[PDB]
Amino acid sequence: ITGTSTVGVGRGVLGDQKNINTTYSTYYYLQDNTRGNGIFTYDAKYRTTLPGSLWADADNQFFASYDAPAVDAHYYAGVTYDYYKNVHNRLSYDGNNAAIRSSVHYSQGYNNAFWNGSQMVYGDGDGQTFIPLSGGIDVVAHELTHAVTDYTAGLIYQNESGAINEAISDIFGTLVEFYANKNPDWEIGEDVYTPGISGDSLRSMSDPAKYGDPDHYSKRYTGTQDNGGVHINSGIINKAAYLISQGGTHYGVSVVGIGRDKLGKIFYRALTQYLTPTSNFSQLRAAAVQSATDLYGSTSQEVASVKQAFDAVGVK
């Protein structure tokens, strides 16, 4: 909407106070004009019609329980925008400052969140498996990364290309969590998953097998559930990314770690310059090797570590 840029204040899902960029015209709307062509957050009102209503508030204060998922969806979209712009020189998900739209309160007790090809959508969770999913910065950044993928590699959401698609989202969701630097880790969704159970998460990149996901190509899932295992076989790529960054020995193969920033540069270049809609795991290895070659040189430690990490997870 047309109005003047304002700064509201509220509390997120985890009870933390934060400022949010709003727009004033009669009401204060969750419309952040400071980033690209705007970040817009909507109320789906427990229905499944999308996007719903642009979030309107009478006083620019967002401390109600009902407001909390909207505060975090709006704020963490801003953090994710900042990461892509400041770290990768990418202006929004399309590289041309496309408006970022998110809807919260999707459906009733909905235990998921997703990018739908047009916008982000967050359930509130059922209070047992999840609390409102926008409370997790890694969740927000994971799903916005699907938009980046849509505009770049376009990895088809099935089988190995779909597992790469998922892993790319887990990788950048985690790198955004480190960028924001609040309780960062190599786990996925820990801030919103199972409020009654401490220390768990949806997936682990450092040890995918902790939740039964494969950490080696020889343990890959070949069935048809989950679009051919896109959230299962992502563990093989997540483990390789973790090893590239942090190093370690895995199934007797040693990997020299090169750190998170170089991991992000290598995978961002692979995603935007080399991967295609049908890339498989072997092609991802080749794309990552070539990306590290471009950035650091064919004789670099970085290239050698990429090779070691894919060797360690059984991907040639």
């Binding site: 998921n112 997703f114 969704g189």
Partner: peptide, 5 residues
């Protein structure tokens, strides 16, 4: 469905 299946 996307953060999980």
């Amino acid at each position: 469905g996307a953060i999980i299946g």
